[PDB]
Amino acid sequence: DPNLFVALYDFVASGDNTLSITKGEKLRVLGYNHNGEWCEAQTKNGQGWVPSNYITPVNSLEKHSWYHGPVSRNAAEYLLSSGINGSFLVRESESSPGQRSISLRYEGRVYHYRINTASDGKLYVSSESRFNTLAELVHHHSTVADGLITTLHYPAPKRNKPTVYGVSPNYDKWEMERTDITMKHKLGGGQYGEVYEGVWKKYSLTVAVKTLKEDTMEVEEFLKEAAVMKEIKHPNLVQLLGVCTREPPFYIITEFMTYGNLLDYLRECNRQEVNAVVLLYMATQISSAMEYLEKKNFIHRNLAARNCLVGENHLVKVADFGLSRLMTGDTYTAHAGAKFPIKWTAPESLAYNKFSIKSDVWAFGVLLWEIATYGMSPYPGIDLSQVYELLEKDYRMERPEGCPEKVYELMRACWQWNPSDRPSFAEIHQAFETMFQESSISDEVEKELGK
Ligand SMILES: Cn1c(=O)c(-c2c(Cl)cccc2Cl)cc2cnc(Nc3cccc(CO)c3)nc21
Numbered sequence: 156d157p158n159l160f161v162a163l164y165d166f167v168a169s170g171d172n173t174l175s176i177t178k179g180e181k182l183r184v185l186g187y188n189h190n191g192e193w194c195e196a197q198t199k200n201g202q203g204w205v206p207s208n209y210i211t212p213v214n215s216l217e218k219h220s221w222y223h224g225p226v227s228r229n230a231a232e233y234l235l236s237s238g239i240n241g242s243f244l245v246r247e248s249e250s251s252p253g254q255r256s257i258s259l260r261y262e263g264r265v266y267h268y269r270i271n272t273a274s275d276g277k278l279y280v281s282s283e284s285r286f287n288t289l290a291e292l293v294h295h296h297s298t299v300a301d302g303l304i305t306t307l308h309y310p311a312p313k314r315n316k317p318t319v320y321g322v323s324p325n326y327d328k329w330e331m332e333r334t335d336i337t338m339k340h341k342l343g344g345g346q347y348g349e350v351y352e353g354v355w356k357k358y359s360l361t362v363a364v365k366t367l368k369e370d371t372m373e374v375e376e377f378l379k380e381a382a383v384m385k386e387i388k389h390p391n392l393v394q395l396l397g398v399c400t401r402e403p404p405f406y407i408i409t410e411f412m413t414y415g416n417l418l419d420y421l422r423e424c425n426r427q428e429v430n431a432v433v434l435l436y437m438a439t440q441i442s443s444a445m446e447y448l449e450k451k452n453f454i455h456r457n458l459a460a461r462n463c464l465v466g467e468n469h470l471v472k473v474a475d476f477g478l479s480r481l482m483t484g485d486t487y488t489a490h491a492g493a494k495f496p497i498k499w500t501a502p503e504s505l506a507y508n509k510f511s512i513k514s515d516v517w518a519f520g521v522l523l524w525e526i527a528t529y530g531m532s533p534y535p536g537i538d539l540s541q542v543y544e545l546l547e548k549d550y551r552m553e554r555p556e557g558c559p560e561k562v563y564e565l566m567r568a569c570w571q572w573n574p575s576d577r578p579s580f581a582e583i584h585q586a587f588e589t590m591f592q593e594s595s596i597s598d599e600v601e602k603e604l605g606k
Contacts, residue, residue, distance in 0.1 A: 159213040160184055160196070164316045170323050175330035182210055193324030204324040208317040221293060221310035225249040227588050232265045232595065233260035233436040233469070234311040245293065255289070257296075258311075259275040261304045262403050265595065268303060304492030314468050320388045322358070322396055325409035329385060330353075330396035333406060336364060341418070346461070346477070348372065352411060355396070362396060363412070365476070367405040372449055374405075381407050383453075383478050387569070391444035392475045393464060412464035412472060420465045427471075431557075431596045434526050437463075437471045439587045444473040445519060448579040449512050454481045456510055459499050460525040479510075486511045497542055498533040505543050513574035519583065521561025522570025527555040527562060546572070559592050561597040 160182045168175035174196060176182065181270060182196040187207065189587070194207045204343045211217040226234065226246040233244050238260045248254040256272045257280065268280050272290065277285035278292045281302035286292040297307045342363060347370055351363040367377045384395040384407065399406035414420055417437065421429070441463055448455060455478060462474045481487050488507040489495075499515035503509045521533050534542065534552060551570050554563040565586055571577045578586070591599065 158183060158532065160210045160543075161213050162210050163217065163313070164209045165207050166316075167358075168203060169360075170204070172204050172324070174198065174201055174205050176200075176205055176209070180374060181213070182401060184210075188324035189326050192320065194283070199292055200458060202411075202538055206317065206319050216289060219290065219293075219310075220313070221245055221307070222289075223311065223313065227439075228256075228267060228589065229259070229432065229435050229439060229588065229596070231267070231311075231419070232432045234258075235260040235265050236430070236432055237313060238309060241305055243307045243309065245289065246312040251417050257293075257307070258417065259305065259307060264597075266304050311445070315470060318390050329387075329395070331399060331408065332403065333399045334400075336362075336368075336408065338364060347474075353408070357407070361411045361413075363393075363409045364406040367403065368402075377405055377407070380476055380478075383480070384409075384450075387453075387475055387478075389444055389447040391440045391470075391472050392447065393472050412466045414465035414467075416461050417463035417465055417471060418460035418525065421460065421526065424529070426529065429529075431559075431600045433469055435587065435590075435596050436469055437465075438523055438526050439574050441470045441522065442519065442580055442584040442587060445515060445585045448478070448515075449483055449580045451462055452481060452483050453478045454487060454510055454512055455515050455518075456487075457496070457499075458515050458522055459496065460522055460530060463522070475478060480513070483512050497539050501574065502543060502546055502572060510579070511574060513577050514570075516569050516577045516583070517574075517581065519580070520566045523562070523566050524552055524555060527558045528568075531555075546570075557600050557603050559591075559596060559603060561599075 162176045162178050162180045162182060165178050166176045170552055176198060180198055180359055182198045185195040185197060187194045193204050195203065196205050196210070212464055216222045221244050223234070223244045223246050227249070229246060231246055234244060235258060238336070240261050243257060244260040245257055257268045257270060258266070259266045261598045271279050271423070273279065273285055277287060278289060279285040280292070280296065284295060286295060288362060293307060295301065296303055298554070300306050335356045337354045337356060339354070342350045342352055349364065349368050350363055350365045352359065355362050365458050367374065371582050377402070381400065387395070393412065396410060397408045459476055464471065464472050477489055489509045490512065491508060493508060495504060497505065499518045499521045500516035504514045524533060525531065537545065551567060565583065568578050
């Protein structure tokens, strides 16, 4: 059937022009909104707007539960860490489209197999067994291993619904009615200011709300934050859902991250569940968010684990309050007297109050060390008076217990004295993705410890 789609995720209607759909249901798509992120569809139940990536053409690989599309080798190992023998998925290379691999779990290890393509287009893992389509290849290996360590029996679940950047398919419908928001308890014991957990009645949706109470944050500052957040769109940066700027108290409403900040999460987690592959997954997400800020000409200035928030299934998002606009390559100078979190501050910032995307790279290195140590305080017992002097003499924190060598080298690259000698976030993200190609991070941690 021409133009037929199938729902990949459930979606509940609440914005009156939106439509409720159930995973597996068929839909006909009528058209798209202004940015293609939402589409008007018809089902046997009705007609209305639904998120475009919650559905897929009946004729596309994404309809298969085992096809996870653009997922990296490391992300695949995370997805399969919750599985059993025979759990598997098929993924595609993000950089080089068309290149696919099978990731399969067996006896606690994940095996990765490249899917080869013959001159006539047939696909195979083992040359003796070639197929016309991907689905036929998977079906074959679902019954006999035929070259694989075991059979493909349990597709890795797609546990996370795609991010929706807002709540409406329409153009700028950010303003919302304050009466539809129920404010609850403050979040973070006040470390983030006037931020409260709240419920957005209209959707019984839990949210985070920052309110401009009198004699707190300056108005221009609050509004600039709201303005900046309207432009930020990335899976790993806290997403804006709406604002209330018609009258005081002004509100900034965002998605709610259920587990709190990364620092507390790492300090209180079960290290068996949150193993090295999970830490790598979280660090990679943070680098992706920073690569986005880098390309969009923003600087953060407060990158640290306490400013990264954790959601379900180890999703991590960087808090995006306080961002500043700065053409990537230029320098921002803070007015003398500014007080900074010394342990996460680059040398040029400490000495000259100069900040750039490169000082964020330095902070990312400290954040990486916090991740690798499950939240230890940086520089143990070093006085917060001799840090600059020590750094100037090339002292740097020591490699964390069990930390793989390549991860520590990345930390050291981030801590180069001269900002121009530090890698870009694009380079950092790419480095994580290509870091454990001939053995797992699990294996490397072993070599580090056994030693
Ligand atoms: C602390 N905090 C914020 O400052 C913002 C936010 C806002 Cl409301 C406006 C602009 C920018 C940001 Cl980052 C969003 C936000 C979302 N989720 C959370 N979750 C959270 C934080 C601390 C503890 C707990 C546990 O109850 C859960 N905390 C959040």
